[PDB]
Amino acid sequence: ILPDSVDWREKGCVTEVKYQGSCGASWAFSAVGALEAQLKLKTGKLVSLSAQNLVDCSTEKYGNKGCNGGFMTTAFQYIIDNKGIDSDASYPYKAMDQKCQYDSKYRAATCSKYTELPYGREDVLKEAVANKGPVSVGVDARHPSFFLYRSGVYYEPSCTQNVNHGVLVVGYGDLNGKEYWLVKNSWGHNFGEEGYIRMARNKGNHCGIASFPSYPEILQG
Ligand SMILES: CC1(C)CCN(C[C@H](O)Cn2nc(-c3ccc(C(F)(F)F)c(CNCc4ccc(F)cc4)c3)c3c2CCN(S(C)(=O)=O)C3)CC1
Known part of the structure:
Protein backbone atom coordinates (compact mmCIF):
# COMPACT_ATOMS: atom_id res chain seq x y z
CA ILE A 1 0.00 0.00 0.00
CA LEU A 2 2.67 2.52 1.08
CA PRO A 3 6.32 2.75 0.02
CA ASP A 4 8.74 0.91 2.26
CA SER A 5 11.10 3.93 2.24
CA VAL A 6 10.78 7.69 1.71
CA ASP A 7 13.49 10.39 1.61
CA TRP A 8 12.14 13.81 0.64
CA ARG A 9 15.72 15.09 0.36
CA GLU A 10 16.09 12.93 -2.75
CA LYS A 11 13.32 14.98 -4.40
CA GLY A 12 14.98 18.35 -3.69
CA CYS A 13 12.34 19.38 -1.14
CA VAL A 14 14.61 19.88 1.94
CA THR A 15 16.80 22.90 2.68
CA GLU A 16 20.16 22.79 4.44
CA VAL A 17 20.22 21.88 8.11
CA LYS A 18 20.09 25.04 10.24
CA TYR A 19 21.72 25.98 13.57
CA GLN A 20 19.29 27.17 16.25
CA GLY A 21 21.94 28.03 18.84
CA SER A 22 20.89 29.25 22.28
CA CYS A 23 17.43 30.27 20.99
CA GLY A 24 14.66 27.71 21.56
CA ALA A 25 13.21 28.16 18.08
CA SER A 26 13.08 24.48 17.03
CA TRP A 27 9.30 24.95 16.76
CA ALA A 28 9.91 27.67 14.14
CA PHE A 29 12.40 25.54 12.21
CA SER A 30 10.05 22.55 12.25
CA ALA A 31 7.38 24.84 10.78
CA VAL A 32 9.34 26.52 7.97
CA GLY A 33 10.86 23.19 6.88
CA ALA A 34 7.44 21.63 6.38
CA LEU A 35 6.25 24.65 4.37
CA GLU A 36 9.46 24.79 2.34
CA ALA A 37 8.69 21.30 1.05
CA GLN A 38 5.18 22.36 0.03
CA LEU A 39 6.61 25.44 -1.69
CA LYS A 40 9.09 23.36 -3.69
CA LEU A 41 6.37 20.97 -4.82
CA LYS A 42 4.15 23.94 -5.75
CA THR A 43 6.66 26.28 -7.44
CA GLY A 44 9.64 24.08 -8.29
CA LYS A 45 11.92 26.41 -6.32
CA LEU A 46 13.70 25.43 -3.08
CA VAL A 47 13.88 28.48 -0.79
CA SER A 48 14.55 28.57 2.94
CA LEU A 49 11.76 30.38 4.78
CA SER A 50 12.40 32.75 7.70
CA ALA A 51 12.35 31.02 11.08
CA GLN A 52 13.24 34.42 12.56
CA ASN A 53 10.01 35.80 11.07
CA LEU A 54 8.10 33.27 13.16
CA VAL A 55 10.11 33.95 16.33
CA ASP A 56 9.52 37.73 16.06
CA CYS A 57 5.94 37.90 14.72
CA SER A 58 4.01 34.72 15.64
CA THR A 59 4.06 35.59 19.31
CA GLU A 60 1.52 36.06 22.10
CA LYS A 61 -1.66 35.96 19.97
CA TYR A 62 -0.52 32.48 18.88
CA GLY A 63 0.63 31.31 22.33
CA ASN A 64 4.30 31.44 21.30
CA LYS A 65 7.23 33.01 23.14
CA GLY A 66 9.97 33.13 20.48
CA CYS A 67 13.23 31.80 21.91
CA ASN A 68 11.27 30.43 24.88
CA GLY A 69 9.24 27.98 22.75
CA GLY A 70 6.20 27.78 20.54
CA PHE A 71 3.88 25.57 18.53
CA MET A 72 4.12 24.71 14.84
CA THR A 73 0.34 24.76 14.35
CA THR A 74 -0.03 28.35 15.50
CA ALA A 75 3.10 29.23 13.53
CA PHE A 76 1.14 28.04 10.46
CA GLN A 77 -1.92 30.03 11.58
CA TYR A 78 0.22 33.16 11.80
CA ILE A 79 1.31 32.55 8.21
CA ILE A 80 -2.32 32.19 7.16
CA ASP A 81 -3.40 35.33 9.03
CA ASN A 82 -0.35 37.32 7.88
CA LYS A 83 -0.97 36.31 4.25
CA GLY A 84 2.74 35.53 4.05
CA ILE A 85 6.11 34.51 5.43
CA ASP A 86 9.40 36.01 4.25
CA SER A 87 12.33 34.19 2.75
CA ASP A 88 15.05 33.33 5.25
CA ALA A 89 17.51 35.32 3.06
CA SER A 90 15.46 38.52 3.44
CA TYR A 215 1.70 19.65 8.04
CA PRO A 216 0.81 22.76 6.01
CA GLU A 217 -0.45 23.14 2.46
CA ILE A 218 -0.21 25.80 -0.25
CA LEU A 219 -3.18 25.33 -2.54
CA GLN A 220 -3.46 26.46 -6.15
CA GLY A 221 -6.52 28.50 -5.17
C1 LIG B 1 -4.27 26.31 19.70
C2 LIG B 1 -3.90 26.50 21.17
C3 LIG B 1 -4.47 27.83 21.67
C4 LIG B 1 -2.38 26.50 21.31
C5 LIG B 1 -1.86 25.15 20.88
N1 LIG B 1 -2.37 24.09 21.75
C6 LIG B 1 -1.71 22.81 21.44
C7 LIG B 1 -2.05 21.71 22.44
O1 LIG B 1 -1.78 22.11 23.79
C8 LIG B 1 -1.35 20.40 22.07
N2 LIG B 1 0.07 20.32 22.41
N3 LIG B 1 1.03 20.67 21.49
C9 LIG B 1 2.19 20.47 22.14
C10 LIG B 1 3.50 20.72 21.47
C11 LIG B 1 3.75 20.30 20.17
C12 LIG B 1 4.99 20.53 19.59
C13 LIG B 1 6.01 21.17 20.29
C14 LIG B 1 7.34 21.38 19.62
F1 LIG B 1 7.35 20.93 18.36
F2 LIG B 1 7.76 22.63 19.61
F3 LIG B 1 8.31 20.70 20.25
C15 LIG B 1 5.77 21.59 21.61
C16 LIG B 1 6.84 22.29 22.41
N4 LIG B 1 6.64 23.74 22.54
C17 LIG B 1 5.71 24.07 23.63
C18 LIG B 1 5.70 25.54 23.99
C19 LIG B 1 4.78 26.41 23.42
C20 LIG B 1 4.76 27.75 23.74
C21 LIG B 1 5.68 28.21 24.65
F4 LIG B 1 5.68 29.51 24.97
C22 LIG B 1 6.61 27.39 25.24
C23 LIG B 1 6.61 26.05 24.90
C24 LIG B 1 4.52 21.35 22.18
C25 LIG B 1 1.96 19.97 23.45
C26 LIG B 1 0.61 19.90 23.58
C27 LIG B 1 -0.12 19.44 24.80
C28 LIG B 1 0.87 19.13 25.92
N5 LIG B 1 2.12 18.58 25.34
S1 LIG B 1 2.78 17.33 26.15
C29 LIG B 1 3.43 17.99 27.65
O2 LIG B 1 3.87 16.84 25.37
O3 LIG B 1 1.71 16.45 26.47
C30 LIG B 1 2.89 19.58 24.57
C31 LIG B 1 -3.82 24.01 21.61
C32 LIG B 1 -4.47 25.34 22.00
Whole structure:
Protein backbone atom coordinates (compact mmCIF):
# COMPACT_ATOMS: atom_id res chain seq x y z
CA ILE A 1 0.00 0.00 0.00
CA LEU A 2 2.67 2.52 1.08
CA PRO A 3 6.32 2.75 0.02
CA ASP A 4 8.74 0.91 2.26
CA SER A 5 11.10 3.93 2.24
CA VAL A 6 10.78 7.69 1.71
CA ASP A 7 13.49 10.39 1.61
CA TRP A 8 12.14 13.81 0.64
CA ARG A 9 15.72 15.09 0.36
CA GLU A 10 16.09 12.93 -2.75
CA LYS A 11 13.32 14.98 -4.40
CA GLY A 12 14.98 18.35 -3.69
CA CYS A 13 12.34 19.38 -1.14
CA VAL A 14 14.61 19.88 1.94
CA THR A 15 16.80 22.90 2.68
CA GLU A 16 20.16 22.79 4.44
CA VAL A 17 20.22 21.88 8.11
CA LYS A 18 20.09 25.04 10.24
CA TYR A 19 21.72 25.98 13.57
CA GLN A 20 19.29 27.17 16.25
CA GLY A 21 21.94 28.03 18.84
CA SER A 22 20.89 29.25 22.28
CA CYS A 23 17.43 30.27 20.99
CA GLY A 24 14.66 27.71 21.56
CA ALA A 25 13.21 28.16 18.08
CA SER A 26 13.08 24.48 17.03
CA TRP A 27 9.30 24.95 16.76
CA ALA A 28 9.91 27.67 14.14
CA PHE A 29 12.40 25.54 12.21
CA SER A 30 10.05 22.55 12.25
CA ALA A 31 7.38 24.84 10.78
CA VAL A 32 9.34 26.52 7.97
CA GLY A 33 10.86 23.19 6.88
CA ALA A 34 7.44 21.63 6.38
CA LEU A 35 6.25 24.65 4.37
CA GLU A 36 9.46 24.79 2.34
CA ALA A 37 8.69 21.30 1.05
CA GLN A 38 5.18 22.36 0.03
CA LEU A 39 6.61 25.44 -1.69
CA LYS A 40 9.09 23.36 -3.69
CA LEU A 41 6.37 20.97 -4.82
CA LYS A 42 4.15 23.94 -5.75
CA THR A 43 6.66 26.28 -7.44
CA GLY A 44 9.64 24.08 -8.29
CA LYS A 45 11.92 26.41 -6.32
CA LEU A 46 13.70 25.43 -3.08
CA VAL A 47 13.88 28.48 -0.79
CA SER A 48 14.55 28.57 2.94
CA LEU A 49 11.76 30.38 4.78
CA SER A 50 12.40 32.75 7.70
CA ALA A 51 12.35 31.02 11.08
CA GLN A 52 13.24 34.42 12.56
CA ASN A 53 10.01 35.80 11.07
CA LEU A 54 8.10 33.27 13.16
CA VAL A 55 10.11 33.95 16.33
CA ASP A 56 9.52 37.73 16.06
CA CYS A 57 5.94 37.90 14.72
CA SER A 58 4.01 34.72 15.64
CA THR A 59 4.06 35.59 19.31
CA GLU A 60 1.52 36.06 22.10
CA LYS A 61 -1.66 35.96 19.97
CA TYR A 62 -0.52 32.48 18.88
CA GLY A 63 0.63 31.31 22.33
CA ASN A 64 4.30 31.44 21.30
CA LYS A 65 7.23 33.01 23.14
CA GLY A 66 9.97 33.13 20.48
CA CYS A 67 13.23 31.80 21.91
CA ASN A 68 11.27 30.43 24.88
CA GLY A 69 9.24 27.98 22.75
CA GLY A 70 6.20 27.78 20.54
CA PHE A 71 3.88 25.57 18.53
CA MET A 72 4.12 24.71 14.84
CA THR A 73 0.34 24.76 14.35
CA THR A 74 -0.03 28.35 15.50
CA ALA A 75 3.10 29.23 13.53
CA PHE A 76 1.14 28.04 10.46
CA GLN A 77 -1.92 30.03 11.58
CA TYR A 78 0.22 33.16 11.80
CA ILE A 79 1.31 32.55 8.21
CA ILE A 80 -2.32 32.19 7.16
CA ASP A 81 -3.40 35.33 9.03
CA ASN A 82 -0.35 37.32 7.88
CA LYS A 83 -0.97 36.31 4.25
CA GLY A 84 2.74 35.53 4.05
CA ILE A 85 6.11 34.51 5.43
CA ASP A 86 9.40 36.01 4.25
CA SER A 87 12.33 34.19 2.75
CA ASP A 88 15.05 33.33 5.25
CA ALA A 89 17.51 35.32 3.06
CA SER A 90 15.46 38.52 3.44
CA TYR A 91 14.85 37.93 7.17
CA PRO A 92 17.80 35.84 8.42
CA TYR A 93 18.02 33.97 11.70
CA LYS A 94 19.65 35.77 14.63
CA ALA A 95 19.01 33.28 17.48
CA MET A 96 17.36 35.86 19.72
CA ASP A 97 13.99 37.60 20.17
CA GLN A 98 13.48 40.70 17.98
CA LYS A 99 10.73 43.11 16.99
CA CYS A 100 8.48 41.89 14.19
CA GLN A 101 10.17 42.96 10.96
CA TYR A 102 7.94 41.23 8.42
CA ASP A 103 7.86 42.90 5.01
CA SER A 104 5.40 41.73 2.33
CA LYS A 105 7.90 42.87 -0.34
CA TYR A 106 9.99 39.76 0.46
CA ARG A 107 7.15 37.26 0.83
CA ALA A 108 8.39 33.84 -0.29
CA ALA A 109 5.49 31.64 0.75
CA THR A 110 1.86 31.61 1.80
CA CYS A 111 -0.12 29.03 3.73
CA SER A 112 -3.65 27.96 2.85
CA LYS A 113 -4.23 25.47 5.70
CA TYR A 114 -2.60 23.01 8.09
CA THR A 115 -3.66 19.60 9.33
CA GLU A 116 -2.92 17.83 12.62
CA LEU A 117 -2.62 14.10 13.01
CA PRO A 118 -4.01 11.97 15.86
CA TYR A 119 -1.74 11.34 18.85
CA GLY A 120 0.44 8.25 18.60
CA ARG A 121 -0.72 6.84 15.22
CA GLU A 122 2.61 6.07 13.56
CA ASP A 123 0.72 4.42 10.66
CA VAL A 124 -1.23 7.65 10.06
CA LEU A 125 2.05 9.59 10.25
CA LYS A 126 3.77 7.19 7.83
CA GLU A 127 0.96 7.77 5.31
CA ALA A 128 1.17 11.56 5.68
CA VAL A 129 4.95 11.58 5.18
CA ALA A 130 4.49 9.44 2.06
CA ASN A 131 1.44 11.18 0.60
CA LYS A 132 1.72 14.81 1.77
CA GLY A 133 5.39 15.57 2.38
CA PRO A 134 7.63 16.22 5.39
CA VAL A 135 5.65 16.47 8.64
CA SER A 136 6.33 18.80 11.55
CA VAL A 137 6.47 16.87 14.83
CA GLY A 138 7.67 17.29 18.38
CA VAL A 139 10.00 14.87 20.12
CA ASP A 140 11.28 14.29 23.66
CA ALA A 141 14.86 15.50 23.33
CA ARG A 142 15.49 15.81 27.07
CA HIS A 143 18.07 13.03 27.28
CA PRO A 144 21.91 13.14 27.09
CA SER A 145 21.80 10.32 24.51
CA PHE A 146 19.95 12.70 22.18
CA PHE A 147 22.58 15.45 22.43
CA LEU A 148 25.28 12.77 21.95
CA TYR A 149 23.63 10.89 19.05
CA ARG A 150 26.08 10.25 16.18
CA SER A 151 24.64 7.55 13.89
CA GLY A 152 22.31 4.63 13.70
CA VAL A 153 18.71 4.18 14.74
CA TYR A 154 18.14 6.13 17.94
CA TYR A 155 16.43 4.33 20.79
CA GLU A 156 16.24 5.81 24.28
CA PRO A 157 14.51 3.54 26.83
CA SER A 158 13.72 6.43 29.19
CA CYS A 159 12.09 8.53 26.45
CA THR A 160 8.53 9.70 27.00
CA GLN A 161 5.67 10.64 24.67
CA ASN A 162 5.64 14.20 25.98
CA VAL A 163 7.27 16.46 23.40
CA ASN A 164 9.55 19.40 23.96
CA HIS A 165 11.66 19.83 20.78
CA GLY A 166 10.34 20.69 17.31
CA VAL A 167 11.71 18.63 14.38
CA LEU A 168 10.79 17.75 10.77
CA VAL A 169 10.15 14.19 9.55
CA VAL A 170 11.43 14.11 5.96
CA GLY A 171 11.24 10.35 5.69
CA TYR A 172 11.28 6.86 7.12
CA GLY A 173 12.82 3.51 6.31
CA ASP A 174 14.32 0.29 7.62
CA LEU A 175 17.99 -0.25 8.47
CA ASN A 176 18.89 -3.92 8.98
CA GLY A 177 15.80 -4.81 10.99
CA LYS A 178 15.47 -1.39 12.65
CA GLU A 179 12.60 0.68 11.24
CA TYR A 180 13.37 4.39 11.67
CA TRP A 181 11.99 7.85 11.12
CA LEU A 182 14.26 10.21 9.17
CA VAL A 183 14.29 13.42 11.22
CA LYS A 184 15.70 16.81 10.24
CA ASN A 185 16.95 18.57 13.37
CA SER A 186 18.04 22.19 13.81
CA TRP A 187 21.41 21.79 15.58
CA GLY A 188 23.65 22.33 12.53
CA HIS A 189 25.54 19.85 10.40
CA ASN A 190 27.84 18.46 13.09
CA PHE A 191 24.96 16.87 14.99
CA GLY A 192 24.01 13.26 14.32
CA GLU A 193 24.08 12.17 10.68
CA GLU A 194 25.01 15.43 8.95
CA GLY A 195 22.32 17.22 10.96
CA TYR A 196 19.77 14.40 10.79
CA ILE A 197 18.79 11.78 13.36
CA ARG A 198 17.16 8.45 12.49
CA MET A 199 14.68 7.65 15.24
CA ALA A 200 13.06 4.34 16.17
CA ARG A 201 9.75 3.75 14.37
CA ASN A 202 6.85 1.51 15.44
CA LYS A 203 8.28 1.25 18.98
CA GLY A 204 5.27 2.62 20.86
CA ASN A 205 5.42 6.23 19.61
CA HIS A 206 9.02 6.40 20.80
CA CYS A 207 10.03 9.89 22.09
CA GLY A 208 6.55 11.12 21.13
CA ILE A 209 7.52 11.40 17.47
CA ALA A 210 3.85 10.96 16.52
CA SER A 211 2.38 12.78 19.55
CA PHE A 212 1.65 16.10 17.77
CA PRO A 213 2.31 15.85 14.01
CA SER A 214 1.07 18.50 11.59
CA TYR A 215 1.70 19.65 8.04
CA PRO A 216 0.81 22.76 6.01
CA GLU A 217 -0.45 23.14 2.46
CA ILE A 218 -0.21 25.80 -0.25
CA LEU A 219 -3.18 25.33 -2.54
CA GLN A 220 -3.46 26.46 -6.15
CA GLY A 221 -6.52 28.50 -5.17
C1 LIG B 1 -4.27 26.31 19.70
C2 LIG B 1 -3.90 26.50 21.17
C3 LIG B 1 -4.47 27.83 21.67
C4 LIG B 1 -2.38 26.50 21.31
C5 LIG B 1 -1.86 25.15 20.88
N1 LIG B 1 -2.37 24.09 21.75
C6 LIG B 1 -1.71 22.81 21.44
C7 LIG B 1 -2.05 21.71 22.44
O1 LIG B 1 -1.78 22.11 23.79
C8 LIG B 1 -1.35 20.40 22.07
N2 LIG B 1 0.07 20.32 22.41
N3 LIG B 1 1.03 20.67 21.49
C9 LIG B 1 2.19 20.47 22.14
C10 LIG B 1 3.50 20.72 21.47
C11 LIG B 1 3.75 20.30 20.17
C12 LIG B 1 4.99 20.53 19.59
C13 LIG B 1 6.01 21.17 20.29
C14 LIG B 1 7.34 21.38 19.62
F1 LIG B 1 7.35 20.93 18.36
F2 LIG B 1 7.76 22.63 19.61
F3 LIG B 1 8.31 20.70 20.25
C15 LIG B 1 5.77 21.59 21.61
C16 LIG B 1 6.84 22.29 22.41
N4 LIG B 1 6.64 23.74 22.54
C17 LIG B 1 5.71 24.07 23.63
C18 LIG B 1 5.70 25.54 23.99
C19 LIG B 1 4.78 26.41 23.42
C20 LIG B 1 4.76 27.75 23.74
C21 LIG B 1 5.68 28.21 24.65
F4 LIG B 1 5.68 29.51 24.97
C22 LIG B 1 6.61 27.39 25.24
C23 LIG B 1 6.61 26.05 24.90
C24 LIG B 1 4.52 21.35 22.18
C25 LIG B 1 1.96 19.97 23.45
C26 LIG B 1 0.61 19.90 23.58
C27 LIG B 1 -0.12 19.44 24.80
C28 LIG B 1 0.87 19.13 25.92
N5 LIG B 1 2.12 18.58 25.34
S1 LIG B 1 2.78 17.33 26.15
C29 LIG B 1 3.43 17.99 27.65
O2 LIG B 1 3.87 16.84 25.37
O3 LIG B 1 1.71 16.45 26.47
C30 LIG B 1 2.89 19.58 24.57
C31 LIG B 1 -3.82 24.01 21.61
C32 LIG B 1 -4.47 25.34 22.00
